Amino acid sequence: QVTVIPREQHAISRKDISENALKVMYRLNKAGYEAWLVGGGVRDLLLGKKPKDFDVTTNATPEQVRKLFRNCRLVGRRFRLAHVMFGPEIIEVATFRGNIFGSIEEDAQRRDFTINSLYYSVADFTVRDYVGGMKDLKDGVIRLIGNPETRYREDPVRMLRAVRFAAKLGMRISPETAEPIPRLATLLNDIPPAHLFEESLKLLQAGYGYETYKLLCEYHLFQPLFPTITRYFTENGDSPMERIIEQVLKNTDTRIHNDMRVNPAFLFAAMFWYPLLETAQKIAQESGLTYHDAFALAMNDVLDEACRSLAIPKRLTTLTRDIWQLQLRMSRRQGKRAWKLLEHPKFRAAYDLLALRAEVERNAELQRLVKWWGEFQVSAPPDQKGML
């Protein structure tokens, strides 16, 4: 066991790569308090990679952190957890937990995985490893802290994170930490649909999506969240839907790394697409009615029972509804309303759906619609007229 690591044996974790939350600790260290830098970035820093967050912890009570910062711009409460604002840098200052407020060692144990529970002191350039941490981090092991069996039951979402980190970094899950998941997965439905929604995005809409999907399928974690989707999987391995999902992911992923923004209302409208389509079939031949009105029903239901697991905000769903709406409208080769359409705020997305539907189905008559809209949108108004 090795509880304190020195700056000379610890990957340099050079004081200078820490931005200036250093101003936030220095203030504490000066006041007779303790300043530690915990979790995310402190992991990354040891890895060599650039921190995305910088969060800190202290033996200073929350009302004590209030006085020592009353002059600062402290953004919004929470319990414990204080929020300092620079601007485009916000720094989280949280008090150690234990009866309620305790020691550094105490705080370490209530944290989830090993590597995400390493601590840095600007004051002594030492990192504290009350857990496997350092080794896990070297060996590339996502390990949980207490008794997996119990933790996952206390907070089931702890399971989701295990995969998420597993995918993000090149790491594998500890056996003990992995055993329980497939069995305990179902536990996710005792989770408020909203919290889920957050984590669904943390997983896919985070630029790892594809590797995190493989991992969510290999642990039966995908099913609880997207019932409406698992059901249309096939033995064969790659149905139109089973490809599209891999693609919209792989791509949303490329986007996020070339730093482009991304539409979640898209991501979803893509996956559920085929399911919607399938419900259009049954809705039509059965309960025989028009294919427009039929489609429109499939929407409400598919979105209903999907919104039954993930809590999608009314905002998103409504763009989604539009992305699908456009799929029918575009299909009907026609004239003057193409300006009306080209203008639509969700066209860009809607074109990128048609993009995929044509790539996956390899339906040459679709890609055909894809070249046309392709040119009719980069073309200039004299040509755009002639195209009709």
Ligand X SMILES: Nc1ncnc2c1ncn2[C@@H]1O[C@H](COP(=O)(O)OP(=O)(O)OP(=O)(O)O)[C@@H](O)[C@H]1O
**What are the catalytic residues?**
53, 55, 112
Binding ligand X (rule: CB under 6 A), the pick from 7, 27, 110, 195 is 110
Residue 117 contact partner, candidates a second copy, ligand X, none, CB within 5 to 8 A by sort of partner:
ligand X
| 318 contacts 333 by C-beta, under 8 angstroms | no
| CA-based torsion, 14, 20, 21, 24: positive or negative | positive
Which residues from 201-240 bind ligand X, rule CB under 6 A? none
The verdict on 322 binding ligand X (CB under 6 A) reads no
In what helix (H) or strand (E) does residue 159 lie, and over which residues does it extend?
A: helix 157-168
Closer to ligand X by Cβ: residue 162 or 241: 162
Residue 50 contact partner, candidates ligand X, a second copy, none, CB within 5 to 8 A by sort of partner:
none
DSSP track, 64-105? HHHHTTTTS-B----SS-EEEE-SS-EEEEEE-B---B--HH
Closer to a second copy by Cβ: residue 332 or 340: 340
Give min distance, CB of 155 to ligand X, in A.
Answer: 4
Closer to a second copy by Cβ: residue 268 or 351: 351
The verdict on 155 binding ligand X (CB under 6 A) reads yes
Q: What are the residues whose beta carbons fall under 8 Å from the beta carbon of 46, sequence distance 6 or more?
A: 10, 11, 13, 118, 127, 137
Give min distance, CB of 6 to ligand X, in A.
Answer: 22
DSSP strands (E only) in the chain: 4-5, 36-38, 55-58, 82-85, 90-95, 119-121, 126-128, 141-142, 172-173
Distance between CA atoms of residues 211 and 154, nearest Å: 27
Residue 111 contact partner, candidates a second copy, ligand X, none, CB within 5 to 8 A by sort of partner:
ligand X
| CA-based torsion, 24, 133, 46, 203: positive or negative | negative
Distance between CA atoms of residues 301 and 94, nearest Å: 43
Distance between CA atoms of residues 196 and 189, nearest Å: 9
Give min distance, CB of 36 to ligand X, in A.
Answer: 12
The verdict on 195 binding ligand X (CB under 6 A) reads no
**Interface residues with a second copy (CB under 8 A)?**
250-251, 254-255, 258-261, 336, 339-340, 342-343, 351-352, 355-356, 359, 373-375, 377-382, 385
Full strand arrangement of the beta sheet holding 126-128? 4-5, 126-128, 119-121, 36-38, 55-58, 90-95, 82-85
Residue 378 contact partner, candidates a second copy, ligand X, none, CB within 5 to 8 A by sort of partner:
a second copy
Strand partners, 57: 36, 94
Distance between CA atoms of residues 195 and 198, nearest Å: 5
Residue 40 contact partner, candidates ligand X, a second copy, none, CB within 5 to 8 A by sort of partner:
ligand X
Give min distance, CB of 222 to a second copy, in A.
Answer: 23
Binding ligand X (rule: CB under 6 A), the pick from 111, 128, 143, 346 is 111
Closer to a second copy by Cβ: residue 87 or 381: 381
Residue nearest to ligand X (CB): 40
Binding ligand X (rule: CB under 6 A), the pick from 24, 56, 58, 112 is 112
Give min distance, CB of 270 to ligand X, in A.
Answer: 24
Distance between CA atoms of residues 43 and 119, nearest Å: 9
Binding ligand X (rule: CB under 6 A), the pick from 13, 58, 95, 117 is 117
| CA-based torsion, 27, 67, 89, 104: positive or negative | positive
Which residues from 34-53 bind ligand X, rule CB under 6 A? 39-40, 52-53
Residues lying near ligand X in the complex (CB under 6 A) are found at 39-40, 52-53, 55, 110-112, 116-117, 155, 165
